[PDB]
Write a protein that binds this ligand. Sequence first.
Ligand SMILES: N[C@@H](Cc1c[nH]c[nH+]1)C(=O)O
Ligand SMILES: N[C@@H](Cc1c[nH]c[nH+]1)C(=O)O
Ligand code: NI
Length: 465
Amino acid sequence: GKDLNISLPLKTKSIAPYETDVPVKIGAAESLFKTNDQGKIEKALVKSYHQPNDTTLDIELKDNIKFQNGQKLTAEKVKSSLENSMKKSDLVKYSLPISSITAKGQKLTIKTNSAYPELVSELANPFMAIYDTDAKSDVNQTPVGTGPYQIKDYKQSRKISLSNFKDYWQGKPKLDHITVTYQEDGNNRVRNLESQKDDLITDVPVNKVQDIENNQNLKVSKESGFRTSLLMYNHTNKKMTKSVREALDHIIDRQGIADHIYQGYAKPATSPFNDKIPYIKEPKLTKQNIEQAKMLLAKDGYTKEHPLKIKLITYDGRPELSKIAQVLQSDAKKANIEIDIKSVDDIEGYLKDRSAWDATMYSFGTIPRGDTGYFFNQAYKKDGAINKGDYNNSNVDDLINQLNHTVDVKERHNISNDIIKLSSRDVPNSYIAYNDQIVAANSKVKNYKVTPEGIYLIDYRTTIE
Ligand SMILES: N[C@@H](Cc1c[nH]c[nH+]1)C(=O)O
Ligand SMILES: N[C@@H](Cc1c[nH]c[nH+]1)C(=O)O
Ligand code: NI
């Protein structure tokens, strides 16, 4: 009827908002701030804010917003939600250096110990979405948000069932029910859409695009966005030296990968950040050079007789990652590297054991809210939530820490470019492609989001006609 079936990759365990962005994606939860369709920060739950000095953020919340259980969204609810999220998540904690929060009625005041210009921006992060900390349910299964669709049932790592929240603050949502099921294999997601098992899918394999476009019952939406695919190195394994990382960097054929594996739905990458961000000074594009790789590996003593052995992790959710792994393995052989590919079902959980991998295929939204700070803090600082390989260089640390308290935007751009230049010398990861997000749907599904931040999907206007 007016029910929507969504098929997503990257199955979750907990679906607390501070564990995954899935509750924001599927319309269950909202952050205080958001980005609009052009990527700019906007008030969402907030009516007004002021910044009277560089350590003070005064917020007045909208007065007409309820949680899905009917409880009013107040300043005290926001305070308790934020403090809980900071307590329970390293990602949230390291993004929000908040020193104190006071609340009364609809007003709260957030303090920092020193200037942190990206505070408002990080309050738009979906991991900072607001939920009712007093709800009598398990926030890991059925968090209570302000979104248009309330989570009613969660089968862990398999299925999320949501129902229309009729009192949703922006307007009456247009669907009755949503069912979200996880499917890691992109080809399976496409088959589910074709057989009408599901109505809306993300992360369409590039080689199925034409097939879907040919179908008059279906439609494809594509967006260049700001997701980067990469080869992430485990810096805690002493064999993963600078020479080894340089060598693997030169076994990659970025141009070939973009043309043939992404079939043109991507561009060759250099830094973490899409070059369509105008202030970014990218490092020089690395072109494939097997001889150079062989030479570099000679430095550490590797030969055809005694090759480097690499355990490379991959996963299906982003469909092109394992295709890249396959051709890396084939090409690396020519350079005296024997790569073992291990595909895993739960990539975030698997990488926690740093004894179990040498490198991994990976994909991340490296600049979701227009600033490079978030990526640096989460990926290049020790204990950052996506620094799976524990890269850390005190000289890069120093610049990141300076960036974090830098207010002048031109100076933020300069420091960010210095961070990019300096860190690139270490090859902390090998950035492979800036690739498009491709979504597909039954043609009767209307008004889902496919916008450049690559987070949002369902809102109160999404519908079926
Ligand atoms: N960050 C990786 C792995 C992941 C699993 N779940 C969320 N993320 C990706 O999005 O592809
Ligand atoms: N899946 C999102 C968010 C995330 C946090 N940690 C891992 N992933 C991304 O890759 O951008
Ligand atoms: Ni991710």
